[PDB]
Amino acid sequence: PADPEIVEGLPIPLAVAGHHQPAPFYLTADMFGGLPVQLAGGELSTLVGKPVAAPHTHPVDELYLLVSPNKGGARIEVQLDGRRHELLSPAVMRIPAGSEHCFLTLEAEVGSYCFGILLGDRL
Amino acid sequence: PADPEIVEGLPIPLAVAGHHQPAPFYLTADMFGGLPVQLAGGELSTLVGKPVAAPHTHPVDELYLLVSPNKGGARIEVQLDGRRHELLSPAVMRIPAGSEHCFLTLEAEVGSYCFGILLGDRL
Ligand SMILES: [Zn+2]
Ligand SMILES: [Zn+2]
Ligand SMILES: [Zn+2]
Ligand SMILES: [Zn+2]
Ligand SMILES: [Zn+2]
Ligand SMILES: [Zn+2]
Ligand SMILES: [Zn+2]
Ligand SMILES: [Zn+2]
Ligand SMILES: [Zn+2]
Ligand SMILES: [Zn+2]
C-alpha cells in the first residue's frame, strides 16, 4: 500500500560537511530510480541569527532559492569565497561548484524557505 | 551594479498549457548560461479550492514538492491520468513525462508551498 510515486518520509537528514547536525534533504539522488539533481533546505523562521554551517563546498553547481509569503519577508547573507552577498526574497543565487559558501538568516517570517538545488547527483 | 550571480526579478510568469494566467517560474532554462532543470510554483494559502490549471503535460519528468511550516499544514489533490492522489506535507510526488496532470489545494496555511521541479530544459 506504499505508493512508489510518492515519498512521505521527509525530510531525509544527511550528514554534510561543515554542518553540526544533518542537513534536511527533500530530493536525493537515489529517488525514483535515480535523480539528476538533489534538493535540501527548509523553513527559516527559527534560524534567524543561527547559522547551520561553516563554509563548505559541493562538486556540482547549486542554486539557492529564497521565498517567503510577503515580498521582502526573508533576507539571508551568503558568503561565497569570503565575499559577502545578500538576498531579499524572492531571490535566486548561483553557487559555483567548489566555491566555499554558507548562509546566515538575517530576517525571516513564518513561511520563509531557502532551498539549495544541487545540479548533479554527488555531494 | 546588477550582480550576474543573483536574480531578483522573480517570479518569471510564463504562459503554460491548461492555465488561465501565467505560471510563476523561479528557475528557467535560460538562467546562468543554461540550466538543466526548471522550477515553478508558489505559496498555497490563497489557492484553497481554486485550481490553477486544467490537466496538462510536460515532455520531461517533474517532481512535486509540497512543504509547510507545520507537519500536515498543506494537503493537495493531484490528478495523474485521471487517477486521484493526495499529498500531505511534507511530500514529494513523481509526475511522469507526458502524464496529464494538475493539482488542487485542499488545505493550506500561511507558508505552504508547492513547487514543480522539471527534470529537463523544455516545456
Ligand atoms: Zn498511484
Ligand atoms: Zn546546509
Ligand atoms: Zn544548530
Ligand atoms: Zn551549498
Ligand atoms: Zn550548504
Ligand atoms: Zn557578486
Ligand atoms: Zn502550473
Ligand atoms: Zn486563477
Ligand atoms: Zn507539471
Ligand atoms: Zn503544472
Closest CB to A6 among B7, B85, B112: B85
Could A117 and B8 be called an inter-chain contact, meaning their C-beta atoms sit closer than 8 Å? no
Would you call A97 an interface residue with chain B, using a CB distance cutoff of 8 Å?
Answer: no
Q: Which residues of B touch A110 (CB under 8 A)?
A: 69, 110-111
The angle formed by the CA atoms of residues A13, B110 and B16, to the nearest 5 degrees, is 85
Contacts of B33 (CB under 8 A, 6+ apart): none
Q: Distance (Å, rounded) from C-alpha A96 to C-alpha A57?
A: 9
B9 and chain A in contact, CB less than 8 A: no
List the resolution, Å. Answer: 1.6
Cα–Cα distances (Å) from A114 to A24, A44, B71, B77, in that order, read 11, 7, 17, 25
Task: State which residue of chain B sits closest to A65, comparing Cα positions.
Answer: B26
How far apart CA A18 and CA A55 sit, in angstroms, is 6
Q: Give me B118's grid cell.
A: 522539471
CA angle A114, A17, B8 (to 5 degrees): 25
Phi, psi of A86 (to 5 degrees): -135, 140
Q: Which residues, including other chains, have CB under 8 Å from residue A40's CB and lie 6 or more apart?
A: A11, A14, A16, A23, A24, A25, A26, A115, A116, A118
Distance of CA B20 to the CA centre of its chain: 15
In which order are the strands placed within the sheet that holds B38-43?
A6-7, B91-95, B62-67, B113-118, B38-43, B23-27, B12-14
- What phi and psi, each to the nearest 5 degrees, are found at residue B31? -70, 145
Q: What spatial distance separates the first Cα and last Cα of chain A, rounded to whole Å? A: 32
**Of how many residues is chain B composed?**
123
**C-alpha–C-alpha distance, residues A109 and A46, integer Å:** 9
Nearest by CB to A36, which of B36, B65, B90? B36
Can the peptide bond before residue B55 be classed as cis, meaning omega within 30 degrees of 0? no
Beta partners for residue A41, in sequence order: A115
What whole-number distance in Å separates Cα of residue B89 and Cα of residue B110?
A: 13
Instruction: Give the DSSP per-residue string, A50-102.
Output: --SBSSB--SS-EEEEEE-SSTT-EEEEEEETTEEEEEESSEEEEE-TT--EE
Cell 542554486: give the residue. Answer: A63
Expressed in angstroms and rounded, the spacing between residue B120 Cα and the centre of ligand 6 is 27
Largest interatomic CA distance in chain A: 50
Q: How far is B17 from chain A (nearest CA, A)?
A: 23
Report the residue count for chain A: 123
- Kindly tell me the burial class for residue B78, based on how many C-beta atoms sit within 10 Å of its own C-beta (0-12, 13-18, 19 or more): buried
Q: Do A63 and B88 touch (CB under 8 A)?
A: no
Which method was used? X-ray
Residue with cell 562538486: A59
Report yes or no: B98 and B90 within 8 Å, Cβ to Cβ: no
Integer Cα distance of B65 and A79 in angstroms: 27
What lies within 8 Å, CB to CB, of A86 at 6+ separation is A75, A76, A77, A78, A106
CA-wise closest residue to B63 among A38, A115, A122? A38
Any idea which residue has 500531505 for its cell? B88
CB within 8 Å: B67 and A27: no
- Which ligand is closest to the CA of B49, given by its number? 8
Contact A114, A74 (CB under 8 A): yes
B58 is in an annotated binding site: yes
What is the Cα–Cα distance from B32 to B4, expressed in whole angstroms? 8
